[PDB]
């Protein structure tokens, strides 16, 4: 009962561009009483060199059913990266002082993506 995440991936191979559309989440679990329902998504390429491997959506306010409707683009993604790397997608709530609480995540091996073929996802978040 952590919550369900919706997203779409496309690897525009010829332009070395992996386009990650973070669509929405539904039923994000209420947690820290002192925290806020200010959800946002973080992307990580694993293994990665930190900083540059990370992308982040807009933070919404007062919602457990956020609609981000946003495409995060990893430019300079190669066949070697698609072979090696895993896309970790993590949902978190931003708190009163710009810190956060981790709600849940999902992971997808980029080997399974096919060049120029959009894959849509509707998954439930998990904790590892």
Curated annotation (Swiss-Prot):
Record PTM: Ubiquitinated. Deubiquitinated by CAND1 to prevent its degradation.
Binding site for Ca(2+) 2: 32, 38, 93-95
Ranges where the C2 domain occurs: 1-123
Tissue distribution of the protein: Specifically expressed in brain.
Taxonomic superkingdom: Eukaryota
Binding site for Ca(2+) 1: 31-32, 93, 95, 101
Location of this chain's protein in the cell: Cytoplasmic vesicle, Secretory vesicle, Synaptic vesicle membrane; Cell projection, Dendritic spine; Postsynaptic cell membrane; Membrane
Subunit: Interacts with RAB3B, RAB3C, RAB3D, RAB8A, RAB27A and RAB27B. Interacts with RAB3A; this interaction recruits RPH3A to synaptic vesicules. Interacts (via C2B domain) with SNAP25. Interacts with deubiquitinating enzyme CAND1; this interaction results in the deubiquitination of RPH3A. Interacts with GRIN2A and DLG4; this ternary complex regulates NMDA receptor composition at postsynaptic membranes. Interacts with SNCA.
Entry note about domains: Binds calcium via the C2 domains. The calcium-bound C2 domains mediate interactions with phospholipid bilayers.
Function: Plays an essential role in docking and fusion steps of regulated exocytosis. At the presynaptic level, RPH3A is recruited by RAB3A to the synaptic vesicle membrane in a GTP-dependent manner where it modulates synaptic vesicle trafficking and calcium-triggered neurotransmitter release. In the post-synaptic compartment, forms a ternary complex with GRIN2A and DLG4 and regulates NMDA receptor stability. Also plays a role in the exocytosis of arginine vasopressin hormone.
Name of the protein in question: Rabphilin-3A
Stretch of the intact protein here: 382 to 509 of 684
């Amino acid at each position: 009962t952590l919550g369900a995440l919706e997203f779409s991936l496309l690897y525009d191979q010829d332009n070395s561009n992996l386009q990650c559309t973070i669509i929405r989440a539904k039923g994000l679990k209420p947690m820290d009483s002192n925290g806020l329902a200010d959800p946002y998504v973080k992307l990580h390429l694993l293994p990665g060199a930190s900083k540059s491997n990370k992308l982040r959506t807009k933070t919404l306010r007062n919602t457990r059913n956020p609609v981000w409707n946003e495409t995060l683009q990893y430019h300079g993604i190669t066949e070697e990266d698609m072979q090696r790397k895993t896309l970790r997608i993590s949902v978190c709530d931003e708190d009163k002082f710009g810190h956060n609480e981790f709600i849940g995540e999902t992971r997808f091996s980029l080997k399974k993506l096919k060049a120029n073929q959009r894959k849509n996802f509707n998954i439930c978040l998990e904790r590892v």
